[PDB]
Structures are given as structure tokens and as C-alpha cells.
């Protein structure tokens, strides 16, 4: 039913068009930390805990 067919004298019969689309992405930030004291390092039995 939807085939493009011409005739003997054909003009302005079969017009077509085009389309484009877009994609996107984003970035985020992460992080974490820990704390300690001087006594914890100095008086601990295990050196090199750091």
C-alpha cells in the first residue's frame, strides 16, 4: 500500500524527511575519610598500623 510509485508525468509526488536525536551523561563526586589520634599511634602494640 505504501510503495513509492511514479507516473509518466510525475512531479511533487514522494517527499521524505529525516530526524536526529541526542544522548547525554553527567559526572558526580564521591569521597570518605577517617581520623586518629597521636596516642593511638604511639601506644599501640603494632607499629606500621598506618
Amino acid at each position: 500500500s505504501k510503495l513509492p510509485l511514479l507516473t509518466e508525468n510525475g512531479g511533487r509526488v514522494n517527499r521524505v524527511g529525516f530526524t536526529r536525536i541526542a544522548r547525554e551523561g553527567s559526572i558526580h563526586k564521591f569521597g570518605f575519610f577517617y581520623e586518629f589520634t597521636q596516642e593511638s599511634i604511639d601506644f599501640d602494640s603494632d607499629d606500621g598500623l598506618m
Binding site: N9, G10, G11, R12
Partner: protein, 50 residues
Amino acid sequence: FTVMTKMPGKETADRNDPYGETGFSSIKWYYGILVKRPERLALIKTVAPL
């Protein structure tokens, strides 16, 4: 006589006919006369038989 011909092809192609399936041919001219001595032209008007 001035004659202009355009066969079907690229030259016929336009927005009205994007495929160029048509053609044409034409002819034209100019004409005119000047009468200097009208009295030298004679005419007779009659009926004619079957």
C-alpha cells in the same frame, strides 16, 4: 522563425518537477506590412454556386 527546444533531462528538472520528465518546443515570429498605394488593389465580391 525562432525555435526553442528543451529535451527531458537535467535542464528540465526544477522544484516543480524534481525528476525532469517533461519537455517542450516553441516557435514565434514578427509580421507586418505597409501599404503605399491602396488604389492599386482591386476587389470584387460575389456569391458562388454549389
